[PDB]
Amino acid sequence: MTLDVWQHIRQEAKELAENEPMLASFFHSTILKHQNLGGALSYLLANKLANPIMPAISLREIIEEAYQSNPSIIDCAACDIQAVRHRDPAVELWSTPLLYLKGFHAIQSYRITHYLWNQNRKSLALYLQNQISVAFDVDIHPAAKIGHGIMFDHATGIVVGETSVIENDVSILQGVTLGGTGKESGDRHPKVREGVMIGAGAKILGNIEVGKYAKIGANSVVLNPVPEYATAAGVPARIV
Amino acid sequence: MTLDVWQHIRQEAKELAENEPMLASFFHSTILKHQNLGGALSYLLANKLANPIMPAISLREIIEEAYQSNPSIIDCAACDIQAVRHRDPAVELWSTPLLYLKGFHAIQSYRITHYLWNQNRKSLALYLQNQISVAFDVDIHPAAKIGHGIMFDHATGIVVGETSVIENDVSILQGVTLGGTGKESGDRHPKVREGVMIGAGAKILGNIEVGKYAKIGANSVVLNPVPEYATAAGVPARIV
Amino acid sequence: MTLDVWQHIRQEAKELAENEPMLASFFHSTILKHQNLGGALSYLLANKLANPIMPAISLREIIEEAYQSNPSIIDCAACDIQAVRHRDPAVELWSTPLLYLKGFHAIQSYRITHYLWNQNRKSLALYLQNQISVAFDVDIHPAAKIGHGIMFDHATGIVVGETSVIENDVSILQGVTLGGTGKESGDRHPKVREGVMIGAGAKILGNIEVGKYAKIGANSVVLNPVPEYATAAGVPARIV
Amino acid sequence: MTLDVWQHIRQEAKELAENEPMLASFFHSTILKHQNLGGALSYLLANKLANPIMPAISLREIIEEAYQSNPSIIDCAACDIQAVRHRDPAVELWSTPLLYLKGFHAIQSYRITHYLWNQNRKSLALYLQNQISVAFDVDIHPAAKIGHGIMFDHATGIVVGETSVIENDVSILQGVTLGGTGKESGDRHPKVREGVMIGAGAKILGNIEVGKYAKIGANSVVLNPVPEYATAAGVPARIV
Amino acid sequence: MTLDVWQHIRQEAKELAENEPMLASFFHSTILKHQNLGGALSYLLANKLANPIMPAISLREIIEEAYQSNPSIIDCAACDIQAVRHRDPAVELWSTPLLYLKGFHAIQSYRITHYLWNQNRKSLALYLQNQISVAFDVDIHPAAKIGHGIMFDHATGIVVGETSVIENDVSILQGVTLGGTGKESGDRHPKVREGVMIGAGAKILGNIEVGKYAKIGANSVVLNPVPEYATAAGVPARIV
Amino acid sequence: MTLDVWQHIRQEAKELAENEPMLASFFHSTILKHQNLGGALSYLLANKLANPIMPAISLREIIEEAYQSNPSIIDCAACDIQAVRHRDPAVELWSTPLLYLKGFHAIQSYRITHYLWNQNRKSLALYLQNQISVAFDVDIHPAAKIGHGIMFDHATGIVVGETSVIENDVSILQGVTLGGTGKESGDRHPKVREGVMIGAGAKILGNIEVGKYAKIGANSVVLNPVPEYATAAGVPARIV
């Protein structure tokens, strides 16, 4: 759910704190001192997206407004923690995604830029979009539509276009682009349907469909729609 | 003119700050309190490249010395702005490249390293080269020869070699490498001629010529010279 | 020998500091004021991994305990220095790898995480794994087994799986992944043997053998064992 | 009224920013981007009381829970702002006490510590009392009872004891101590009545009455009750 | 004694952390994560004295060297903690002097400057003496000889001269100077003997004796030797 | 000459750096990397005055503007340096006032606020005045008229009124106030003529003349004019 992902997170944090004295202050600052997942998540992102021109204090306020003006955002964060947890068997702790995984952080920071975008506060959405790219090395245009249960593993170098759509339970690895072919304007980015898995370095270009539960091979260049439950691979990509 | 670009930037920022209270101090610190593009660019790069050992205040002095010794560096920055603008229908504001795009930032920072390199202040050149890599995720060798009207779109993972040449109006997407095959010294990096557009993740290796206005497809490995206006794609690349 | 590398680095530093006044305090803070390489390295890594939640002062004490429980980690560092040095004719000074190259840094930082992993201090190793990802854009799982004389050139986008092995004298470029094909647990990552060189963007997936002195061509996708001294290239890769 | 004061301050801010481009960002971050006085006051205070161990972001959440449990601390601030402005002919703008006067900052900070203390959250009240001393050079025991319309002019070196009382519209200059004589416990500090003005350097020791509207001359040491509207001066002091 | 004071401090910290979640990180960072009192003290001082040109990381290494080469400093720290605890009735906890009191902090910082002075590393001693004056508003020349059991209560504006001597169990309040009359060189500062209590604002000028257990009245100017167990007062000071 | 004071400062700095490796970075950032006193001083003051809202990089540009418009200001700094050099036999290095004495730092910082005040940039003058009070614990109204050859020894707690006049070669100790009696406006502060020396804690109130080369005793309250070369002591002060 959400309140109980929070509780499991709080309960792990106390243990983790007990077993690692060099990291207690860290567990207290990021999780233990907060009352809800929102307080913690905002504290983390604001600190991580912070810089000398726009300090953490100035960014937290901005994040907490979006959390109050749209609490679903936090729920979507909770569904993401669960996703990474259940889809990356190397992850056992519920707190791990929240504390350490930059992909997860970029996803949740993007949700905030999307909210701002839909509120027409574009210069602020752009500022964050790009600071997200600096901190996490993930560039998601605020206008993309991204569901929940999302996992951006390792994440470095992922780029997502303005008109891209990413449905629920999608997993994307490092270096993939959901970009364009060349049509400078209009619907021109991929529509990645549910359950899709995208291999490291894959380039998906155009306003084309990636059928649900498809698998996209590492480094493939996907230029044509992909049938559901199929595997595409190669350069350019073909079903195999 | 550089001066007109500045005038447009200032105008935009006055209205941008009107429309967004949360971000007004930002527009003010980055643009409105400055009297020309150089003071602004130096404030922006200094801050973005700053870190605990070499802070903003220490870096700005170096950048400002460079702009004063070679004024035209600012000129190329303004020509790169127009470029992104003209080449990206997504970018309506002149201020955007300047304030937010890490690729733009990486290029301008490189120009400073290039001036330092040509003046044989190479350790400083290497310092900045690498801090550009840390902050923007772009690694451009100071010896690289880069013209203007350039666009590093998204930019993450762009690596450019010591003997590479990039002439005007070139466009490079994330993940591309202009590198070598393994001759360890001498002229061994690409020659990207005017108007060339390089797709996301392309690897162009060797002292080979990439022809003006030629197009390189995503994830293509280019090991052979590409004719002007031609399109190269595949791994290895072939003329399509 | 370490003491000798250290000695070369110090004499280079006094020289460097004299020729570039603007960087003198830098050479003193990072090299001259320390009495051995671990002092320099720790100060350098602490400062680069520092963030507002865990400051340099806290990180340094963790790094220094590691260097005390295992002085050889510092020895592997001098070894990596020698390697970048003679495996790239563009690096001439011994101080260069230590002071500037994020690949070098990510690797020595990973060594600390690896020692933490074997001390069963995983929350800490995980924290650092991911800060290294944020700071240098290199994501190496603490459990990976890596030798010395290692070169991570440019480094941006390198991801190394939990069960990966990277023997001595290997060179890896930007964008390469050492990952899995989808077996969720158990041995599932690459065993890269000695002397191997991996080109830009290659993705090597699966618990497969990459024979000593093998060479992987850029953007390749290696899914089958690669013979010793063989060259592989393509999507998917073929012994070439 | 607080909203009145808030209004004049916002108004001054817009004009202040307009008249000094170099400080516009400061005006926007401290006053303009906030919707009320507590928001601005919490930002100014968290920022100024910040330190490497407890940064602004951590302190502002604390100041804000206090403003929420006891909104009347904010009113008192407004009232204190009216006082400096109207007892200091040299302060013409409402925004001045709020933005620049450490005496004013010290007082509103103590107020937070007072609330905490009565909430029996003493370690937190003590942490703040002492950071207030470090930042503003005013040391005020949290248990002290301090009214409104108070002016701590210049403020440097003011010290207020645990059992002290300071009623409304009192003025206190730099270097004054409201302390004790040596009775180590119990009511043992000055009762400073309304409208009382204390000149620079005076030491007022013991559980004694300082009469309503009395005046203490500089450097006097007051060890005996002071009649209302009377002037005391000398070492020791005597009614003059 | 040192190890016992340290355990009581560790014991209170664990308790204080449980009772104030908002401050737990602070208690772990300042106390709990350290193995001894010297590791905690150094963390505190390095952080408090820190500034943008000489960061905490750099100061800590300098303080730890001193504690390594002369361990008694920490012991004198424990003895001071004890002092404030038996001499200020308004101070229950052992952890308080160590965690919040700037006079305590100033004193411990001076001990490091006195050590460096005695090792003739005078630039380092002067840098700190002055940074101690900036952070705690206490200016103690490194050459003064100060014993233990010392209590600088409130402390703002305390100034101690080059040849001053302060013996064990002395108490000094805010604003006092142990200074000179004007002989520009030689022995020229007060010799404050054991058990002396100096009231707020007193100025003790000259190389005169302040007899053991003497009491100096607030704001007094002491220009002549003071008899033991006597009480001096006035400007200029005379007995009782 | 200012240039000779500079050459001497550089000279000492080069040797100080040789002798103290822990502070070499400091000598280099503060002195050796600059080309004139202006550069060093602006760098020093910008860092000392920086805070989270108004960073070092933002303040230096303010100071450098001031130095470029009234170069005489730097000349006044060199004069204040020599003054501390021989009026304080404890100080023999020309670099000491410059690098470590906060009273010097405050005087020089005041000069910048005075230039700003006389240019009607009063909000900027007020921001600095008070940041000077927080940084150095010295509060000097920007309008006060101060000459050169000044020395504020220790300096803590010095407060100087709006109409105060301080001519050349004056010496002021900690805790002294040049303040008013209560006439709320007009000419209401002391006129301190040349060579005057003021003891610690003295309070001089009202528009009264302190005659050249007069001497003021510690803790005095001067309420009546002081003849040239006279000595005044007491509460109130009498002529001695």
Swiss-Prot record, chains A, B, C, D, E, F:
PROSITE patterns from the UniProt entry: HEXAPEP_TRANSFERASES
Source organism superkingdom: Bacteria
Protein's cellular compartments: Cytoplasm
Pathway, per record: Amino-acid biosynthesis; L-cysteine biosynthesis; L-cysteine from L-serine: step 1/2
GO biological process, alphabetically ordered: cysteine biosynthetic process from serine
Keyword RNA-binding in annotation: no
GO MF entries: serine O-acetyltransferase activity
Enzyme class label: transferase
EC assignment: 2.3.1.30
Catalysed reaction equations from the record: L-serine + acetyl-CoA = O-acetyl-L-serine + CoA
A UniProt-annotated Pfam family: Hexapep
This protein's record includes keyword Repeat: yes
SMART domains given in the database record: SATase_N
A GO CC term attached to the entry: cytosol
SUPFAM superfamilies: Trimeric LpxA-like enzymes
Leader sequence residues: none
Matching InterPro entries: Hexapep (IPR001451), Hexapep_transf_CS (IPR018357), LbH_SAT (IPR045304), Ser_AcTrfase_N (IPR010493), Ser_AcTrfase_N_sf (IPR042122), Ser_O-AcTrfase (IPR005881), Serine_acetyltransferase (IPR053376), Trimer_LpxA-like_sf (IPR011004)
Official protein name in the record: Serine acetyltransferase
Lineage: Bacteria, Pseudomonadati, Pseudomonadota, Gammaproteobacteria, Pasteurellales
